[PDB]
């Protein structure tokens, strides 16, 4: 029952939260199970899933580096990375974030899908994802393989 318990703990704490930065509260709790449950990722996964559902419609967090970081974290527990990344992208989550382009095309490259990887990296550049130079650098590294 425990996983659902820490979720209920959090979910309640959040109702008493009269404040400006919901995301920051979730971080406190998410970090907490992180430093206290290397055992069962069952806790992280639950929290992570509800992070998404909670923030799916909170457009103002969609390029927040910490939200995007949990998105990348959660990707690790996903069965279908193609679907997952594409989902993130076409809901505008991380569309201005270099890491999301680098992680996503990085998986594509690893899969030997070089042409897909190329488009993902170039899109990120077209869209002006930041840090700009970091994305431009990885895209150059990618190119040496052609």
């Amino acid at each position: 029952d425990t996983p659902e318990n820490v979720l209920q703990m959090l979910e309640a704490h959040m109702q008493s939260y009269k404040g400006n930065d919901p995301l920051g509260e979730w971080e406190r709790y998410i970090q907490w199970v992180e430093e206290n449950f290397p055992e069962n990722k069952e806790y992280l996964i639950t929290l992570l899933e509800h992070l998404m559902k909670e923030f799916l419609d909170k457009k103002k967090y969609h390029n927040d580096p910490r939200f995007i970081s949990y998105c990348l974290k959660f990707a690790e527990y996903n069965s279908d990375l193609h679907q997952f990344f594409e989902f993130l992208y076409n809901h505008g989550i991380g569309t201005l974030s270099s890491p999301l382009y680098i992680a996503w095309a990085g998986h594509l490259e690893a899969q030997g899908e070089l042409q897909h990887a190329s488009a993902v990296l170039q899109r990120g550049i077209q869209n002006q994802a930041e840090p700009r130079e970091f994305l431009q650098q990885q895209y150059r590294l990618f190119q040496t393989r052609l």
Partner: peptide
């Protein structure tokens, strides 16, 4: 791992 299809579906 979790099933991303099921997971994303719940999200709509």
């Amino acid at each position: 791992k979790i099933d991303t299809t099921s997971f994303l579906a719940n999200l709509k």
